[PDB]
Design a protein around this ligand. Structure first.
Ligand code: MG
Ligand code: MG
Ligand code: MG
Ligand code: MG
Ligand code: MG
Ligand code: MG
Ligand code: MG
Ligand code: MG
Ligand code: MG
Ligand code: MG
Ligand code: MG
Ligand code: MG
Ligand code: MG
Ligand code: MG
Ligand code: MG
Ligand code: MG
Lengths: 65, 126, 149, 86, 195
RNA sequence: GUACUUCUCUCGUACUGAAAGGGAGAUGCAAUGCAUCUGUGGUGUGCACACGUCAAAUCCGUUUGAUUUGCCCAACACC
RNA sequence: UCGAACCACCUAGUAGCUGGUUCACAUCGAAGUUUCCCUCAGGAUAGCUGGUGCUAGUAGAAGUAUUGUGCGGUAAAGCAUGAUUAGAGGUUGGUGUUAAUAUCGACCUAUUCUCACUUUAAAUGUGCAAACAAACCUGCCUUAGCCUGCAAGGCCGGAAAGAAAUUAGAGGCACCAAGUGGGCCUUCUUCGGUAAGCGGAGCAGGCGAUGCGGAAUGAACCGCUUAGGGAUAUGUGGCGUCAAAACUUAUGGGCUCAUUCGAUACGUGAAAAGGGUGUUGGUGGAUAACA
RNA sequence: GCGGCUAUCUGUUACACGACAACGCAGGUGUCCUAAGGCGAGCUCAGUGGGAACAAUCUCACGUAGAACACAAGCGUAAAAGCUUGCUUGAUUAACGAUUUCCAGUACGAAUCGAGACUGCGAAAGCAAGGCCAGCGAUCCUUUGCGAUGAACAAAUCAUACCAGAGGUGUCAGAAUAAUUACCACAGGGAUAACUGGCUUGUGGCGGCCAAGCGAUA
RNA sequence: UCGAGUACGACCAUACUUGAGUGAAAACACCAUAUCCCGUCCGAUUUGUGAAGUUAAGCACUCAAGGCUCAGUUAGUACUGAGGUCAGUGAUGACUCGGGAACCCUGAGUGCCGUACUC
C-alpha cells in the first residue's frame, strides 16, 4: 500500500538540508585528466613557492627584528 | 509590517488567518505604549522608560518611545530595526466581539484588508 | 511499476517544440564554458546521445568539469531529507549558458559604475526617478459604471 | 548469428571456446567426493528448475603468433556459425 | 502558540560527570574566573574542563613543541615564552629527542612527560598555579591535541558505502576482505564517490 | 581477603599483499646527494598586534595583521 | 487416553503467533513510508524520534515572498494526425433504366456536428542566482590552450560596495539507540466500479497519540489545541423553557399557515420532473371595454 | 482456490518540474544482426499528379515525413540518423577515471562524460570503444584464459592462488521439491471467506406524468 | 561611384511560397568543350578546361493574397490558487481575495546585421 502521505512533512521536520557549498568536496577528481594533470603540476610549484615564501619571512623577521 | 511588493504578497497568501489594515497614528502608539515589549537580551521586557529603548536599539536615532512610533508610523529608515527589536504584540481579544472569523471583512465576516478600519478593531484590542 | 526505464514518461519532455526541429544551433556549438559558470541543462532531443535523465531538465548548476565534448554539471537534487549535488555528464548541446546572474551581472556593472560616480567617479548623472507617491491628478475623461446587459 | 572465421588484428584464429573438462581432483570436487560420500541425503543442491535457453559465447581470439590466447565474449545468440561472410 | 522551535535546543553539557575532587576545584576556580572576568581564555578553558574524558584528547610533547616553535618564530625574539595550556593531558613523545624549555599547563602529565619537560629546562605548571600567572590567560597558547585518527572515529561510518574508508568492526582482520571488498567478487566497494 | 612478583603472554605503537614478501620525516641542490621539525593551501578557538570606534573612564565590546590548537575540505609526498 | 497408547527422559522442545510484563515526576516525542527478503501477521535498511555531543558560527539559515532567469504542455482552448458523420450535389465500381438515366459506397466540394490529437496555453508549481573576492586595478608562477601578449587553470596582493523583503527565533556536521514499517478520515482532483459508509492514487490537513468549547448525539466536522488557579475578554455556537444569555429585544424589512409547516453544516439526503383554476415577485405585449 | 503475473520496456494512468498505485488499461521483452556494426560519399522517402515497343521503369512536377530506421511503442532524423554504394571491424584492448538512472544514494543491468593505446572510415574538421534508450545474473562450485604458493629442503607433474571471462540461479538481490485429510491436530486470525449485523438501489420484481397511436388511456 | 554585389555567416518564414514585375555596372548564373586528373551506363549530375555568348532560367530589387510575426479584440471570458456553520444539489453555482487564457476576427508589415573585398 503505497501512500506518500506524511512523507513531505517527514522530510521537513529535521528539514531538507541545503546542499553543501562548492568549497566542500570540490575534488576535481574523475574529471578530465589533461586539466587535473596540469592543475596538479601547478599545485606542486605553488607549494614550493608557499614553502619558499615562509623561508624569507622568518629570515627577514630574524635579522630585521 | 511594511507594504513592499515582496511583503504585501506574504499577506495575500495568509489572509484567512490575518486581519490587517493601515494603522492610525493614534493606534500605533496605543500599541507601543500599552502593549509594547522589547527584546532585551532575548526577553520580553516591557517598555517602562525611555532608558530601556536606547540601550536596546543603540542606533543613534531611536531614543524615546514617541521615536519608535515615528519610525513605525512612517515606513521609516529604521523600521526593520524598531519592529524586529520588539516582540509581536500579544493582544487581547477585541471587546464587543468579532463579527465572524471565517469570512473576509467585505463579505460580512472579518479578515483580510480593512483599510483604516482596523483602528476600530485594534482599539477594542489594546 | 511495470516500466521505469531511463526514458519513461517523457513523450512531451524530450519532444522538440513546434516548427523548431532538426540540428542544434551553431551558437550551442560555439558556446564557451568554464569550470564554474552556470548552465541550464535543457536536454534537447535530435541529438539523442548524451541526454541526461528526465529529472535534470529544468535544472541549472555549476560546471565542475568541461571535457572535450562533455560538460560536467553539478545539480542540487532534493532526495528525501537532504539535497545531493549530483554530478551529471552531458554533451554541450544539452547546455545553455545560464542567464541566471545577469540580474546582478548587469546590475553591479552599472550600479557600481554609478555608485563610484556617486562616491568618487567623475560626476553624478541623475538616475531613475521615484515611483510611488501622491499627487493632485488632473483627469482627462470622466466616466461611470452601472451595467452592460 | 554469423561470425568471421578470420579477424585481422593490429595489437586471429577463432575456436569458439567450448571447454568443460570437469576434472577429477579439483578441490571443489574432492570436497564433494568426500562431502557427498555415504549416508545423508544428496548432500548438496542441484539446479532443477528450467534455464536460460540461450547461452553466451566466449570466443577465443588465439593469435597466429604463437602464444597468449585472448578471449572475447559475445552476446547471447541461439545459433552461432563461423561461416565467415559467404 | 505554534513554534516549530522544538529541536533548536542544543546539548551544552552544563556540568561535569567527573568525580575527581581535584577537577571540581579547578571548575569552581574557572567558574569564578570564567564568569567574573572579561577573559576570553577563561570562558574557553572552562567549557573544556567540564568536557568529558574522551573529548579532552591528549597532546604529545611533539605537538606542543612544534606549535610553540611556530609561535616563537614570530615574536619579539626576547618578549616571553607563552604558556602551552592543554586541558587534556600531556604525553611524552619518543620521536622528539630534544625539547625546548617551554612552560606547560596540563591537568596531567605522563611520568615520562613531566621528566622530559623538567629535564629540558621548562617547568610544567598546574591550573591552581596558572591562576597565579596570567589568570586572565594573557600570553597562553591553548591547545587541544588530535582526536582524529583515534580508532573510535575511524570506525564511524558504514565501510560498505562507496567512499567510506572506515574500519569494519571485526576481530578477525582476515575475515572480511572477500566478496564486496574485491573487484573480482561481483562488486568492489567504490573507494571514491563525490559527496 | 590484603600485600609482593620477576618471568612471560595480551592488546598497539604500522601498514600492506592472494602469496612470495615488502614496509611510510620534511625542506632546499639534484634527477641520489647534503644541512636534516607543523607539509600545502583553505575554513579555523584562544592571545599579542595595532585599529579606531556613544563608550563612566579607560578597562573592555569592534576589528585588522601574526601564529593559528582541534576539526573539516582540497591535493602533495611516502609505504 | 489410540489416524499411533502410557510412563520417564532429551525438554524450560520451537513458535515471525496469542496473553501478560510490578513506582513517581520531569524533559522531549513519533511511525504505519523507502528499498531488499520463499518477502506481504516478520525482518533488515533509510526516514521519523531520543540521548550524548563536537564545533569559530545571524549562517553552508528558510515548506515565505521579491527580482531577474530558466523549465513544463495539465486546465481552458482549438480541430492538422484522426475523427465521427449525415445535409446540400458532382471521378470510380456494381447495377435498376430508354449512345439518354441514375443508384448507393469510394471519392469531389462548401461544410457540418460534437471528441480524443494539436500550441512555449494558464493558475498552481519547481531550478537557479542575488555583496568582501560573484567586479575591478593589478602579477605571480607551470604555461595546459593558441599562434611576446590574449585567454586558461592554481594562485595572488592592491584595492569594493551594497541609499532580494522577512524572520534575522544560531549554521554545520557526528555518534549511539529505540519505537514504527496493519493506518484511517478528510479537503482539493481522480483512476477503477451499477453503486457504496467501495477499491487505488496525488495534495495538504488531521485522527491515531487529544483533551477542552458546541454541531442535542458522533475518533475526524466548527472553534481552539491543552502546567495549577483568579479575573477581563472573546472563538465556534448561540439568547422562549430545559440552558448561562434579547427576564419573549421599544427589534426592524419582507416572507410564511403548511389535515407532519418550517427550524444548526458534514451526518445518509428531503425529495425529482410536473402542472394548476393557487398565495407573493418580475418582463413581453391590448383594450379607456370584465362578467 | 484454479486462472493468471514476479525480472524488465513504451504509452497511458498521472494531475504542465520530479515522484506517484491498483488480477489498472494498452502493447513488448528473455531476442535478432560480420551486417541490421563503423565511416565517407551519393541520394531523397510515403505518396501522389500526369506521361512510354512492350506497358513495372525510365520522365520530369509538387511533395515537413503522411515512409524508413531488426522488433513493442514514444521521442527523434530530409544535402539524414532513412536509401544506394564504397572502404572496414571501434562489436577490440580499455590502467578504468567519474557519473546517471534503481537507489539505502548498495549491487546489478543499461546508459553518459572521459583517458591510454591500437585502429578503421574520411581530403578534412570530425566520427566510431556496437546496432540509443527493454534483451539480463551474487557467494560457492565447475571451466578457460592469464604469465606466486604447496610451509624440513630440491626438481618436475599435480593442485591451489591472484587476474578476466564463461557454465546460473525467470521465484530473474540468486532453498535443490508432488499430493491428499470429511479422522485430521495446533498456533492464532474478523489482517481473511461461509455466517451474522449492516451498506451498496443497479438486478429481480413495483409504481408517474406524456402516449405514433393502441384501445390519446375502461 | 554609390547603393549593393559573392561567399562566409549569426538570429531562423516579417525571412516561407505563390502570380508577376525587375535587373543599370560588375558578379553569380546557365553557357562552350572530352584537348587531361576525373567518373559520368549519361559531360545530366560533377570534374578536368575557358567567354562565341545570355538574362531564357537562376538570383537579388519592386508590388501584394495565404502562412508567418507583431496587437486590437476575444475577455477579466473560460479556466485557476485560496476562503467560507456559502446556496442548493452531490449536478457546479455565485460570492470574496487574487492570477488570467486560447481559437477566432479587425489589424500592423512581410526580414534584420557582420567580417573581409570591389567601385
Ligand atoms: Mg461568533
Ligand atoms: Mg593515527
Ligand atoms: Mg592561515
Ligand atoms: Mg480540454
Ligand atoms: Mg522552493
Ligand atoms: Mg480536535
Ligand atoms: Mg444535529
Ligand atoms: Mg467573564
Ligand atoms: Mg418580523
Ligand atoms: Mg526499437
Ligand atoms: Mg516501429
Ligand atoms: Mg552517428
Ligand atoms: Mg535499475
Ligand atoms: Mg556497471
Ligand atoms: Mg541495450
Ligand atoms: Mg554512431
Amino acid at each position: 500500500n503505497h501512500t506518500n502521505h506524511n512523507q513531505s512533512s517527514k522530510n521537513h521536520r529535521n528539514g531538507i538540508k541545503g546542499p553543501m557549498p562548492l568549497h566542500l568536496h570540490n575534488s576535481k577528481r574523475g574529471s578530465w585528466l589533461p586539466a587535473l594533470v596540469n592543475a596538479r603540476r601547478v599545485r606542486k610549484h605553488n607549494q614550493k613557492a608557499a614553502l619558499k615564501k615562509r623561508r624569507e619571512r622568518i629570515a627577514a623577521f630574524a635579522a630585521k627584528n | 509590517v511594511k507594504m513592499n511588493k515582496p511583503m504585501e504578497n506574504m499577506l495575500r497568501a495568509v489572509e484567512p488567518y490575518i486581519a490587517y489594515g493601515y494603522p492610525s497614528l493614534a493606534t500605533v502608539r496605543a500599541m507601543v505604549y500599552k502593549r509594547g515589549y522589547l527584546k532585551i537580551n532575548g526577553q520580553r521586557v516591557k517598555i517602562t522608560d525611555n532608558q530601556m529603548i536606547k540601550d536596546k536599539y543603540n542606533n543613534a536615532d531611536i531614543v524615546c518611545a514617541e521615536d519608535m512610533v515615528n519610525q513605525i508610523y512612517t515606513c521609516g529608515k529604521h523600521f526593520r530595526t524598531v519592529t524586529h527589536g520588539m516582540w509581536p504584540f500579544k493582544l487581547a481579544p477585541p471587546a464587543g466581539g468579532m463579527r465572524q472569523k471565517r469570512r473576509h471583512f467585505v463579505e460580512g465576516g472579518d479578515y483580510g484588508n480593512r483599510d483604516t478600519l482596523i483602528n476600530r478593531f485594534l482599539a477594542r484590542m489594546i | 511499476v511495470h516500466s521505469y526505464g531511463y526514458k519513461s514518461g517523457t513523450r512531451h519532455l524530450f519532444a522538440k517544440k513546434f516548427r523548431k526541429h532538426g540540428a542544434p544551433s551553431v551558437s550551442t556549438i560555439l558556446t564557451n564554458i568554464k569550470v564554474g559558470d552556470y548552465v541550464d541543462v535543457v536536454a534537447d532531443s535530435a541529438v539523442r546521445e548524451g541526454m541526461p535523465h528526465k529529472y535534470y531538465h529544468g535544472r541549472t548548476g555549476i560546471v565542475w568539469n568541461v571535457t572535450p565534448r562533455g560538460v560536467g554539471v553539478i545539480i542540487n537534487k532534493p532526495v528525501r531529507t537532504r539535497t545531493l549535488r549530483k554530478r551529471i555528464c552531458v554533451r554541450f548541446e544539452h547546455v545553455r549558458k545560464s542567464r541566471c546572474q545577469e540580474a546582478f551581472k548587469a546590475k553591479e556593472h552599472q550600479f557600481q559604475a554609478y555608485l563610484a560616480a556617486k562616491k568618487a567617479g567623475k560626476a553624478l548623472p541623475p538616475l531613475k526617478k521615484s515611483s510611488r507617491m501622491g499627487g493632485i491628478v488632473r483627469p482627462k475623461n470622466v466616466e461611470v459604471l452601472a451595467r452592460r446587459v | 548469428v554469423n561470425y568471421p572465421k578470420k579477424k585481422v588484428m593490429h595489437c586471429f584464429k577463432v575456436v569458439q571456446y567450448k571447454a568443460g573438462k570437469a576434472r577429477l581432483f579439483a578441490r571443489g570436487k574432492r570436497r564433494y567426493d568426500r562431502k557427498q560420500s555415504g549416508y545423508g541425503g544428496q548432500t548438496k543442491p542441484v539446479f532443477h528448475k528450467k534455464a536460460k535457453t540461450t547461452k553466451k559465447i566466449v570466443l577465443k581470439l588465439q593469435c597466429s603468433g604463437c602464444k597468449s590466447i585472448r578471449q572475447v565474449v559475445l552476446k547471447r545468440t541461439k545459433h552461432f556459425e563461423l561461416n565467415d561472410k559467404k | 502558540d505554534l513554534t516549530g522551535i522544538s529541536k533548536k535546543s542544543r546539548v551544552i553539557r552544563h556540568h561535569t560527570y567527573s568525580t575527581n575532587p581535584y577537577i571540581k576545584l579547578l571548575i569552581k576556580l574557572y567558574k569564578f574566573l570564567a564568569k567574573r572576568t572579561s577573559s576570553g581564555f577563561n570562558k574557553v578553558v572552562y567549557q573544556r574542563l567540564i568536557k568529558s574524558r574522551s573529548n579532552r584528547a591528549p597532546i604529545s610533547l611533539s605537538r606542543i613543541a612544534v606549535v610553540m616553535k611556530r609561535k616563537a618564530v614570530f615574536t619579539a625574539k626576547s618578549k616571553a615564552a607563552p604558556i602551552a595550556v592543554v586541558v587534556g593531558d600531556v604525553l611524552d613523545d619518543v620521536r622528539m629527542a630534544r625539547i625546548p624549555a617551554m612552560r606547560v599547563c596540563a591537568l596531567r602529565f605522563s611520568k615520562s612527560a613531566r621528566q622530559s619537560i623538567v629535564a629540558a629546562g621548562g617547568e610544567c605548571l598546574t591550573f591552581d598555579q596558572l591562576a597565579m600567572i596570567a589568570p586572565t590567560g594573557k600570553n597562553t597558547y591553548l591547545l587541544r591535541g588530535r582526536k582524529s585518527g583515534r580508532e573510535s572515529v575511524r570506525h564511524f561510518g558504514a565501510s560498505g558505502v562507496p567512499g567510506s574508508h572506515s574500519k569494519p568492526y571485526a576481530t578477525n582482520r582476515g575475515k572480511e576482505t572477500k566478496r564486496g571488498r574485491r573487484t573480482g567478487r561481483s562488486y568492489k566497494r567504490k573507494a571514491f564517490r563525490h559527496v
